[PDB]
Design an enzyme around this catalytic site. Structure first.
Site: not given
Ligand SMILES: CCCCC/C=C/C/C=C/C/C=C/C/C=C/CCCC(=O)O[C@H](COC(=O)CCCCCCCCCCCCCCCCC)COP(=O)(O)O[C@H]1[C@H](O)[C@H](O)[C@@H](O)[C@H](O)[C@H]1O
Ligand SMILES: CCCCCCCCCCCCCCCCCCCC(=O)O[C@H](COC(=O)CCCCCCCCCCCCCC)COP(=O)(O)OCCN
Ligand SMILES: CCCCCC(=O)OC[C@H](COP(=O)(O)OC[C@H](N)C(=O)O)OC(=O)CCCCC
Ligand SMILES: [Fe+3]
Ligand SMILES: [Zn+2]
Lengths: 122, 232, 263, 211, 41, 249, 30, 79
Positions: H36-38
């Site tokens: 997942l992205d930040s």
């Protein structure tokens, strides 16, 4: 050997009703209320005594489920104080007197949820 | 005996009645100078029937608190901060000795710990700084180290020099001309002759220096500072 | 007026009667009580001819007895019961130090070993409670444990804490960065940067703490009574009647400590 | 650079001011507690009933509050201090419980003493040090910060070193010893009446010159 | 032997200690730990 | 009891002494015309019995101080109503004597409570180990509790004595037995306080600051009145008989 | 140092002394 | 307890259109394991605080990078 004070140091995670985590420090062998007393989030003048007869749920603390199976339970009047001096005459099953809970070495990292302070003057 | 204490108590009663009358008279005139926080210390504090006896040729510092039945010999000095207390028994201080700064002498106040032993100090005893002699007898012509912790029942005989920081255990005599130091007092070596002469030399120099202070410490009060304190 | 004159006369009569009755009560005691007399203890006295030259910023507690040629630097302080006896040789106390409570500083009579030197203390140096310094030569920014017993000939270097209750023996040099304690020399351990920060912050803390004690110990009688009455008046608060009266009560500035000494 | 000033007083006429209030903080000394004239009370010390503080004590709590319990004595030449914080992480205030004998030249600082805890002479109790109840500390004892003494047990020596375990007959002599010291302190207490007559001498000496 | 047996298992069991001791400690003390409790509410 | 708890302690000191005297004077003045005997005596008889029973069995469980005082006052009101239920000259005399004794003893107890209010005493266990810190206040409060208990060699036993005598004067033997049972029960929880402050020594001690000269002087006077009353009780008896006899003529 | 110089305390003091005189007379004259 | 709330905090993670139920464990890092992205991590945190009353303050919202830490924090909460 040298008997350092740091051996009997118990650290807990008392949380105020404002949802802020606090790293409190107590001693092993004394009451949990005494440990909550140094931080001052519980007024020391309210519950100066450690006797059960001198308790009116002003030391009441809410305990998570995972910590309730490793300390002795309410015997006869630990529940009575909860079911007498409360707004609702019913037990929470997640609350316990901080006056009767003694701190053990294995009881580190315990999270206690101190509720809103009730009046205690007269 | 008991009768004297009754008259002493009646003396307190009458003295306080007169003092209260004095305060009422002063306060009725519109003056409140009796409410000052003046230090109510006496350098020769006593109890009912002890009244410490001090020789006129001796020198006692103003900060010294001589309490009880303390007897002071000729030429001995009682320096600043020493807390010589002799209520229970006599505290004989020898002639020509000296009690240095921030020292003291007990009499082992509580009578629970067996019998209380009176303190005896010999002549020309160079008691050291911060000496805490706990009601022990000390013979003449000896030296006591700085920070010593002599306890009750100890008989430090003649020339028994005691090292600094010593904690000689109770009822343990120090042999003549032998040094004891450490925790606790253990044998270190034997006293040498140059130090034997040095003990008396130091005693004489300290006595002379005390005479000099007593000559200069008895100077009049120098009312200039009295005016300075009031005018603020 | 005339009523005031009559009342003053009655006050004099009552004062005389009270003093006479006090005298009678004293006589009934058998004269077995030592009279209080007056405080003969004096700070900053002349031993033979030399006076202690104390700076203006120095706090010297009234109970202290600083006698002899004593040279004390700016910002430092002398606390209660402490004795800076300097009869024989000079005691050059540096600037920014603190000779703490019940401490004794004395100097040998130039013949304890034949090569005696006067006691010297550097700057930013803490000494601790009830320490004994007899001929030492402390240099700047050094820590001395409370109750220490530094004998003659010892030199402690910068940042060279002496453990409390130590018995540093004759002519013992403590290297910088070392902590020595116990009855013998008995090196314990090296220095830590946390500990150097603690030393510096304690040294500055006592400097910015000493001025309140200096001010309180030097208040006139007409002023201390006023402060006592003010403290009595504002001992406790009452928000109920304060809000009902439409007023607010703020503590006077003279009863508030500076924020630097608060935790 | 050092320079003299004329504000200096070479004779503090008033005395010592045994009770030193710091702003709103005041030494709360209770009645029937003997405090010798040489004692200096500064900061926020509280002396409780039946206690006794002997001459030379320099009780000051300008950093943190210091307390003396019921019928507990602090002997002569004992310097007690407090700190902002302690290494153990506990509150740094030093509290002395009931029936505690301190002993002369005991340099307490931010310690914690349980009741019935006789302390010997030359004691250097340090920050965060704790003493459990019914215990005796022998004379000359020194303990570093963060070091505790367990329940009734005898210690001493230059470091915190075990000596022996207390017996039942000897461990009840602590309260009797504290009571005896309290009795002797009360014997001293009756010696001097309130409101000393020095002010009369103040007026007499002031009448010698001017006003 | 019978006298010594019945001086402990008769007189000290069914006469004074245990039988009529229902009037001393644990006989009426607990009786008033219920009657007095349900009277404040 | 909630009013006694919540109200400030100086108020409840005044709320339990002065109003009762005036209301009982009103009841006495009404009784001179309420000559029915079948509408006023039996209702007060039943209410007296109920009040004694409930006070005795309710102050047993109380752990606070002012709640216990409130329930003790209710029980004393029941004992007081016993004397009015008789409806004779001796009944009214016992009534007035009991009122006077109860007022003095309540002043004593509330002087104690306001004395201990300095350090915010709330529960019965706070005053533990008071026999060592303040022995004289401890013995004074113990004497007050015993005076409540009706222990013979004190005031507070004379009132209950002559109350029971009046009750037997009218032949109400059921009142006497209930009075005895309630007196025993109340004595138990009165001496429970003495146990908490003379025998049991808790680990934690609470120190109480000294009081002022007003409370101290009132306390000393009341304590000397309570103990030394059974040596010279004639003036109170005579004045109460004159008061009761003056109610009708 | 000849007059109290307080125009408020003197009336209180004379009131106190006349109260004492009244008390002693009331004891005596009655 | 942790087990009761785990069964409900696992359900909300399925609505992110990136998380596959075949690659989720009680020990599953959002940034590393889930990839997942930040920003996706902060959206996961946002979904967590909408599950119940607590707001997950800013200071403690940066120490739940792993799902087990988040579950422990949620379980050991007064709200
Ligand atoms: C061998 C000897 C045998 C032994 C000889 C025995 C002799 C017996 C003598 C007994 C004297 C009796 C004295 C009665 C004492 C009463 C109490 C003293 C009253 C008193 O504080 O003083 C005046 C007040 O004034 C009156 O408001 C009201 C006070 C009026 C009452 C004053 C009456 C004094 C006249 C006494 C007769 C004079 C006769 C003189 C006798 C000497 C003749 C030579 C000063 O007020 P103040 O505001 O400055 O200060 C007061 C005071 O500080 C404290 O009460 C409080 O702390 C403070 O709040 C404030 O109230
Ligand atoms: C029956 C047998 C047992 C009884 C024995 C009785 C013996 C006779 C009475 C003895 C009286 C002794 C009194 C000695 C004189 C003391 C004078 C002190 C007066 C005084 O100091 O003034 C004020 C004190 O208030 C006061 O002292 C006055 C207020 C006192 C309140 C008393 C109220 C009486 C009316 C109600 C009584 C109860 C009746 C119930 C039926 C200020 O005090 P301070 O100067 O110390 O400074 C303030 C400290 N806070
Ligand atoms: C004959 C002596 C009269 C002396 C009168 C007198 O001194 O009043 C003071 C005392 C108490 O008043 P203070 O607390 O302000 O004492 C202040 C401080 N102790 C002072 O001395 O000023 O009054 C009484 O108790 C006596 C009441 C009964 C009085 C008959
Ligand atoms: Fe509780
Ligand atoms: Zn020297």
């Amino acid at each position: 050997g040298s008997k350092k004070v740091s051996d009997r140091i118990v650290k807990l995670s008392a949380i105020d009703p404002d949802g802020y985590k606090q790293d409190i420090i107590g001693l092993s062998g004394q009451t949990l209320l005494r440990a909550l007393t140094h931080t001052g989030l519980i007024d020391p003048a309210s519950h100066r005594l450690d006797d059960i007869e001198a308790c009116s749920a002003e030391c009441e603390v809410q305990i998570a489920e995972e910590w309730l199976e490793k300390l002795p339970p309410r015997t006869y009047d630990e529940e009575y104080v909860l079911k007498r001096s409360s707004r609702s005459r019913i037990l929470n099953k997640h609350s316990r007197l901080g006056c009767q809970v003694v701190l053990t070495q294995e009881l580190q990292g315990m999270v206690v949820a101190v509720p809103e302070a009730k009046p205690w003057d007269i | 005996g008991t009768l004297g204490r009754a008259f002493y108590s009646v003396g307190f009663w009458i003295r306080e009645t007169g003092q209260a009358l004095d305060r009422l008279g002063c306060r009725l005139q519109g003056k409140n100078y009796f409410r000052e926080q003046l230090s109510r210390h006496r350098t020769l504090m006593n109890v009912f029937d002890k009244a410490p006896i001090v020789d006129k040729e001796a020198f006692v510092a103003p900060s010294a608190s001589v309490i009880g039945d303390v007897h002071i010999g000729r030429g001995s000095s009682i320096w600043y901060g020493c807390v010589l207390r002799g209520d229970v028994n006599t505290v004989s201080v020898g002639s020509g000795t000296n009690i240095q700064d921030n020292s003291l002498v007990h009499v082992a106040k509580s009578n629970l710990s067996g019998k209380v032993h009176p303190t005896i100090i010999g002549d020309n005893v160079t008691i050291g700084h911060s000496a805490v002699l706990h009601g022990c007898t000390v013979e003449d012509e000896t030296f006591i180290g700085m920070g010593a912790t002599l306890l009750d029942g100890v008989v430090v005989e003649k020339h028994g020099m005691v090292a600094a920081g010593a904690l000689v255990r109770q009822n343990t005599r120090i042999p003549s001309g032998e040094v004891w130091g450490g925790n606790p007092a253990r044998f270190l070596r034997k006293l040498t002759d140059e130090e034997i002469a040095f003990i008396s030399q130091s005693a004489t120099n300290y006595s002379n220096l005390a005479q000099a202070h007593a000559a200069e410490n008895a100077k009049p009060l120098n009312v200039i500072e009295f005016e300075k304190v009031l005018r603020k | 007026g005339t009523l005031g004159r009559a009342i003053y006369t009655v006050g004099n009569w009552i004062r005389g009667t009270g003093q006479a009755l006090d005298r009678v009560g004293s006589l009934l005691q058998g004269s077995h009580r030592i009279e209080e007399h007056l405080s003969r203890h004096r700070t900053l006295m002349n031993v033979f001819d030399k006076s202690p030259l104390v700076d203006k910023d120095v706090f010297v507690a009234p109970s202290a007895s600083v006698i002899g040629d004593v040279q004390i630097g700016k910002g430092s302080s002398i606390w209660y019961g402490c004795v800076l006896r300097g009869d024989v040789n000079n005691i050059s106390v540096g600037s920014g130090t603190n000779i703490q409570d019940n401490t004794l500083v004395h100097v040998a009579k130039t013949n304890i070993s034949g090569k005696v030197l006067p006691t010297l203390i550097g700057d930013n140096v803490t000494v601790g409670h009830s320490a004994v310094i007899h001929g030492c030569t402390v240099e700047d920014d050094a820590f001395v444990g409370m109750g220490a017993t530094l004998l003659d000939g010892v030199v402690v270097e910068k940042h060279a804490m002496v453990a409390a209750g130590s018995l540093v023996k004759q002519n013992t040099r403590i290297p910088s960065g070392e902590v020595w304690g116990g009855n013998p020399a008995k090196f314990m351990r090296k220095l830590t940067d946390e500990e150097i920060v603690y030393i510096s912050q304690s040294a500055k803390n006592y400097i910015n703490l000493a001025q309140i004690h200096a001010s309180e110990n030097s208040k006139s009688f007409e002023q201390i009574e006023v402060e006592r009455a003010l403290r009595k008046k504002y001992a406790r608060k009452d928000e109920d009647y304060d809000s009902m009266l439409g007023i607010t009560r703020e503590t006077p500035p003279e009863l508030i400590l500076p924020d630097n000494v608060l935790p | 650079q050092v320079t003299p000033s004329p504000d200096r007083v070479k004779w503090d006429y008033r005395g010592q001011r045994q009770i030193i209030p710091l702003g709103q903080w005041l030494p709360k000394v209770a009645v029937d507690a003997y405090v010798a004239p040489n004692v200096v009370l500064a900061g926020q010390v509280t002396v409780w009933d039946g206690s006794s503080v002997w001459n030379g004590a320099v009780l000051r709590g300008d950093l943190n509050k210091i307390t003396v319990g019921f019928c507990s004595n602090v002997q002569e030449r004992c310097v007690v201090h407090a700190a902002w914080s302690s290494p153990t992480g506990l509150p740094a205030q030093t509290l002395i419980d009931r029936y505690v004998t301190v002993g002369a030249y005991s340099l307490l600082r931010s310690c914690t003493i349980e009741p019935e805890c006789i302390i010997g002479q030359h004691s250097i109790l340090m920050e965060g040090s704790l003493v459990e109840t019914r215990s005796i500390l022998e004379a000359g004892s020194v303990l570093p910060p963060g070091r505790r003494i367990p329940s009734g047990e005898l210690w001493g020596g230059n470091p915190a070193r075990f000596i022996r375990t207390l017996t039942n007959e000897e461990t009840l002599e602590i309260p009797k010893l504290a009571v005896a010291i309290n009795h002797l302190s009360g014997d001293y207490f009756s010696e001097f009446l309130p409101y000393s007559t020095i002010y009369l001498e103040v007026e007499k000496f002031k009448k010698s010159l001017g006003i | 032997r019978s006298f010594l047996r019945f001086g402990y298992e008769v007189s000290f069991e069914a006469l004074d200690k245990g039988a009529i001791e229902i009037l001393g400690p644990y006989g009426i003390s607990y009786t008033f730990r219920r009657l007095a409790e349900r009277i404040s509410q | 009891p909630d009013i006694y708890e919540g109200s400030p302690t100086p108020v409840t000191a005044f709320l339990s002494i002065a109003p009762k005297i005036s209301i009982f004077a009103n009841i006495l003045r009404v009784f001179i015309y309420g000559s029915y005997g079948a509408t006023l005596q039996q209702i007060f008889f039943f209410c007296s019995i109920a009040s004694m029973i409930l006070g005795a069995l309710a102050a047993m469980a109380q752990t606070k101080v002012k709640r216990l005082l409130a329930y003790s006052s209710i029980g004393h009101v029941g004992y007081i109503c016993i004397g009015f239920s008789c409806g004779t000259i001796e009944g009214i005399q016992s009534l007035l004597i009991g009122i006077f004794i109860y007022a003095l003893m309540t002043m004593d107890a509330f002087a104690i409570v306001l004395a201990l209010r300095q350090t915010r005493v709330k529960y019965i266990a706070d005053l533990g180990a008071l026999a060592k810190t303040n022995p004289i206040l401890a013995i004074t409060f113990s004497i007050t509790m015993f005076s409540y208990a009706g222990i013979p060699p004190l005031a507070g036993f004379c009132s209950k004595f002559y109350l029971f005598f009046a009750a037997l004067g009218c032949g109400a033997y059921f009142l006497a037995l209930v009075g005895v049972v309630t007196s025993v029960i109340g004595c138990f929880y009165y001496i429970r306080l003495v146990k908490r402050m003379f025998f049991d020594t808790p680990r934690t001690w609470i120190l109480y600051e000294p009081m002022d000269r007003n409370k101290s002087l009132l306390l000393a006077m009341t304590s000397f009145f309570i103990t030394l009353f059974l040596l010279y009780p004639s003036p109170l008896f005579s004045v109460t008989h004159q008061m009761a006899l003056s109610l009708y003529l | 140092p000849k007059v109290s110089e307080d125009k408020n305390r003197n009336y209180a003091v004379v009131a106190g002394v006349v109260a004492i005189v009244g008390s002693i007379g009331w004891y005596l004259k009655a | 307890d942790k087990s009761e709330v785990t069964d409900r905090v696992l359900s909300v993670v399925k609505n992110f259109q990136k998380v596959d139920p075949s690659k989720v464990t009680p020990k599953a890092n959002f940034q590393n394991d889930l990839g997942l992205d930040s920003l996706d991590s902060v959206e996961v945190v946002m979904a967590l605080e909408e599950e119940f009353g607590f707001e997950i303050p800013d200071n403690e919202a940066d120490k739940i990078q792993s799902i087990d830490l988040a579950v422990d924090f949620i379980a050991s909460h007064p709200q």
